[PDB]
Symmetry: D3
Subunit: 109 residues, 6 copies
């Protein structure tokens, strides 16, 4: 059922929207890309938060003690991106989702 | 950016919920699982629709004359699964999404 | 029960918001109206989609071979309106919905 | 922009779902029709509440003094229907929306 | 289940909090984000206020307090004005209105 | 804008309120409606608790209170158990957990 792919696609969409904000400076487009970035950001946050609450059971946290702070930093990096036009912040959020994805599949093997 | 993975994952939750409905008889669980199935089914229907309306542009409908119908047959297979406890109806929906995933990537490479 | 009135009313909010964007220059209002236009546009797109997936059954697609495309052209006309301040793009979307409303009722009588 | 047609279609859907609950007694269908009835009911309530807050301006209330309690009774009748399997409660909610619709069009003339 | 205007107050306190942050800044991005947040939080403030009126407040509450109907409407309208404005004063007018509904709320929990 | 666990508490108080109404009744319709409401309100309780953890609580709050991370996870999981159960005791376990996060919340508003 669970997959971090839903967090990736929404966060891949945040960076995509940020790259497009650089090559167009029209007020209407800027506003629209801010409305979509806020929605896609909160959705990415939800999917990451769900992985932490509903999937990762108590023995997983005893196995990877840094997981708790990682999920928090992932959510926080995504909130920074939600507030930024810089694609690097969206990529920081993607790099943070990749770390969770690595740990996620290491619990399916 | 789009990816039919969003539809598949939500459709995979439907078949998984249908299967959990056969190993438990408790009225409260049957009720909860029905609510969840109704939620993920309409979410899967949303993701399939969005692909069709926002991703798939006119050159794709000319290259794939069957695409229009494949999407409608998926949305209806998923509506069937939404009102069925049978894991097969959910597996039928997943198989239609698999046909959309194949066409999707053939338009991403070249 | 279904009715394309739900799509038309939300699409009518889009054209009305586009028109209000031409008589005011205030940055805050342009911003608010853009947010609202993005909201009602996707709501209109939802109502058009739901007609196509849940109401329109296979005998309708055989009777109207152009229905599949009419719905996709509406969803795209509405996506154009969503990213345009031009009242015409919103009126183009309303005109496509009007073609869906005509076909809708022809299948309700007989 | 505003139209009570959105409240009608959702409340016409509540009565429709209640009629179908009478001709089928299978636990799965009953649960599904309860999930759809709860959603369609809250949506009907929202559209009626919006007509009252966003459309009807202060001179309209000075013109029809019974409007305030009508909108409340409409919302309450719809909450009774949300809780009932009886189609008559859904029709009571529809009859109450018809009264608002009558007053609505009498403000457009 | 359980109702409380504290839900309406917090989403309405968010509208004023956003309007105060819009005064010291000028950045096209920050201004836009605040408007998106103000539109959503004001619409949520309007939902909670409407819920108390329909779902919580029963018919005798309308006889005992005849002013309640017009008060809830003026709160919802004040919250629409706050949604449309950038001025913290219109956001505070809605908090003043919610405070009045809050006073009537706890009076009925005593009844 | 402004955060408060009172949002999490009320949606979590609704879960227990629903579970108590499920005990005295047996009606197939009333039982179903309560389950739909319990699923929605518990999922909303889980949202607010998650929001406080990511959006409100900053990094020094995690150093000062090292137990916070596991507490929020156990609250979210306790709320998942309440969502799955009909017993008011599991709905109260989540209120006990939220009460602990509430204590830590007001301590940081003093800091």
């Amino acid at each position: 059922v669970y997959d971090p792919a839903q967090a990736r696609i929404e966060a891949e969409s945040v960076k995509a929207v940020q790259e497009k904000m650089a090559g167009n400076d029209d007020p209407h487009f800027q506003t629209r890309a801010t409305v979509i970035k806020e929605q896609r950001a909160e959705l990415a946050k939800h999917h990451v938060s769900v992985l932490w609450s509903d999937y990762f059971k108590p023995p997983h946290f005893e196995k990877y003690p840094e997981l708790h702070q990682l999920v928090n930093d992932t959510l926080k990096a995504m909130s920074a991106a939600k507030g930024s036009k810089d694609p690097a912040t969206g990529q920081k959020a993607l790099d943070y989702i990749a770390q969770i994805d690595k740990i996620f599949w290491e619990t399916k093997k």
